[PDB]
């Protein structure tokens, strides 16, 4: 539900699914 309701979740879902080896962006949970 975190990747379904927050920007942080969707970003981390996309970045891991695309195999992009760039360093993890700092972000916090917000609605």
């Amino acid at each position: 539900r975190r990747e379904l309701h927050t920007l942080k979740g969707h970003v981390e879902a996309v970045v891991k699914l695309k195999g992009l080896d760039i360093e993890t962006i700092q972000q916090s949970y917000d609605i």
């Binding site: 969707h10 916090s28 949970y29 609605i31």
Partner: protein
């Protein structure tokens, strides 16, 4: 006289996941209605709409920007410049969407707010999209954002803490977004952590659902992340 068709045409746009058009199916709702007391249904559709449109841009932004950093780490100006100009298009798009909702929120939505929770939602919403501007802006516009954000969030907080119960979704949601504003935009982790726990504790003593439960979990996750490195 029948503005109910646009309510129906936006539910389709949501269902088909075409969000930019749902915004248009909701811009009409606020204007054709004129200046009426806007319902719970249409508000959430407007909320969901603009949030999903912006969300799609910020996601693009935060990815593009993070690719640009791994490129400045190698010093490839011919690569970075093309990334940045592409980001320029996204930043330009973002500006317009915010410069679309805010004065529409200003013109027909903030003035026509009756109940206690309605005023908090819309003011929180104002503070939100102002904060969304602060993410990418640099100049005098950036300072104006952080200022307009701080004033809007505090204006909402006063009504939220007093008029609404500590376990009310938006009172925590406001507190959650207010909490990120300090940490992300104002770079002061101190005042952020304090407001985060304070809104959490008061909601705990009240506990004694669904939407409220989820937001508390986001607060706790932020604290544990804001106390890591």
């Amino acid at each position: 006289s029948t503005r109910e068709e646009n309510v129906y045409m936006a539910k389709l746009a949501e269902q088909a996941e075409r969000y930019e058009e749902m915004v248009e199916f909701m811009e009409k709702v606020a204007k054709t209605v004129d200046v009426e007391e806007l319902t719970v249904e249409e508000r959430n559709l407007l909320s969901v709409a603009y949030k999903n449109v912006i969300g799609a841009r910020r996601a693009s932004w935060r990815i593009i920007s993070s690719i640009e950093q791994k490129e400045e780490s190698r010093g490839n100006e011919d690569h970075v410049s093309s990334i940045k100009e592409y980001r320029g298009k996204i930043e330009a798009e973002l500006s317009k969407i915010c410069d679309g909702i805010l004065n529409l929120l200003e013109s027909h939505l903030i003035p026509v707010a009756s109940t206690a929770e309605s005023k908090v939602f819309y003011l929180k919403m104002k503070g939100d999209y102002h904060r969304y501007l602060a993410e990418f802006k640099t100049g005098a516009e950036r300072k104006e954002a952080a200022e307009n954000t701080l004033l809007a969030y505090k204006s909402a907080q006063d009504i939220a803490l007093a008029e609404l119960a500590p376990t009310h979704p938006i009172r925590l949601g406001l507190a959650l977004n207010f909490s990120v504003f300090y940490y992300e935009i104002l770079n002061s982790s101190d005042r952020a952590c304090n407001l985060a726990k304070q809104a959490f504790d008061d909601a705990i003593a009240e506990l004694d659902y669904k939407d409220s439960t989820l937001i508390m979990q986001l607060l706790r996750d932020n604290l544990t992340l804001w106390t890591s490195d």
